[PDB]
Amino acid sequence: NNMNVIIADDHPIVLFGIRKSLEQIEWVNVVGEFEDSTALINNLPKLDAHVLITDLSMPGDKYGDGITLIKYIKRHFPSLSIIVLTMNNNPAILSAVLDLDIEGIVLKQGAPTDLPKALAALQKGKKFTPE
Amino acid sequence: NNMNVIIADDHPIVLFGIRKSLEQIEWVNVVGEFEDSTALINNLPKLDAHVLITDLSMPGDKYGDGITLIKYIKRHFPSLSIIVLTMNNNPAILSAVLDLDIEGIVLKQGAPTDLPKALAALQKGKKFTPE
Numbered sequence: 453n454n455m456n457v458i459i460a461d462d463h464p465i466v467l468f469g470i471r472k473s474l475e476q477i478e479w480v481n482v483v484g485e486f487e488d489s490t491a492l493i494n495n496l497p498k499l500d501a502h503v504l505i506t507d508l509s510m511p512g513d514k515y516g517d518g519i520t521l522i523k524y525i526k527r528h529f530p531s532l533s534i535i536v537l538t539m540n541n542n543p544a545i546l547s548a549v550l551d552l553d554i555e556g557i558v559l560k561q562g563a564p565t566d567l568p569k570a571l572a573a574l575q576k577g578k579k580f581t582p583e
Numbered sequence: 584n585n586m587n588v589i590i591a592d593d594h595p596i597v598l599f600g601i602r603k604s605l606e607q608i609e610w611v612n613v614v615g616e617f618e619d620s621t622a623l624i625n626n627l628p629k630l631d632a633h634v635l636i637t638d639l640s641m642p643g644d645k646y647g648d649g650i651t652l653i654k655y656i657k658r659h660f661p662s663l664s665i666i667v668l669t670m671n672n673n674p675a676i677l678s679a680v681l682d683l684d685i686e687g688i689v690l691k692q693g694a695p696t697d698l699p700k701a702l703a704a705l706q707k708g709k710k711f712t713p714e
Contacts, residue, residue: 464692469600561595
């Protein structure tokens with residue numbers, strides 16, 4: 453029932469909105485917030501996270517962003533579920549990442565409403581993908 | 584004591600974070616939210632707003648964005664106080680707008696913390712400007 457989530461975005465107001473929304477959901481606990489994928493990857497093993505909710509465009513020299521970062525996480529944290537926050541519904545972008553077998557895609561600007569629904573889907577072992 | 588504010592930004596999550604923060608302040612009421620300066624300007628006369636909190640980069644063909652939009656508002660709503668939300672502390676950008684005698688500048692990403700402080704300053708008839 454309880455789900456521990458990490459949220460990662462290089463915009464502090466995105467993290468604020470997401471935390472405010474998730475604080476309304478009894479069974480979701482935010483166990484970390486990051487703005488850089490190096491900090492993320494460095495601290496990931498230390499947090500008993502179930503789901504990573506992440507932007508694909510953050511700073512991170514060591515491990516990268518986008519597809520490169522996803523590949524890194526899938527290999528090194530293979531049971532960590534991943535929800536991608538996307539700035540748009542670009543057909544090509546989605547494809548690349550959906551092929552990697554991530555669990556969810558949410559339009560970033562709708563995250564406070566849509567994340568709770570994506571996380572409920574995940575809890576049922578189902579994927580969530582924008583309309 | 585009571586302050587009615589309009590918030591304007593083309594990013595729905597920015598508006599969400601700001602509303603969540605201002606809902607903690609008894610004496611501040613959000614009377615409107617906009618994502619386009621045409622909608623803003625069209626509905627401004629209809630809302631008994633004291634302060635406009637606005638991004639400078641929103642869509643708006645009719646009345647514009649940035650300096651052009653500020654000039655429009657200063658002329659047509661000359662007692663409306665304006666707080667600009669800025670994506671950065673660029674020395675040049677700030678100058679241009681500070682010369683127009685606006686009341687506040689807040690770094691957008693810090694708005695949930697900083698706005699309450701900017702609005703308290705405004706209430707004392709003082710300006711608020713990032714560090």
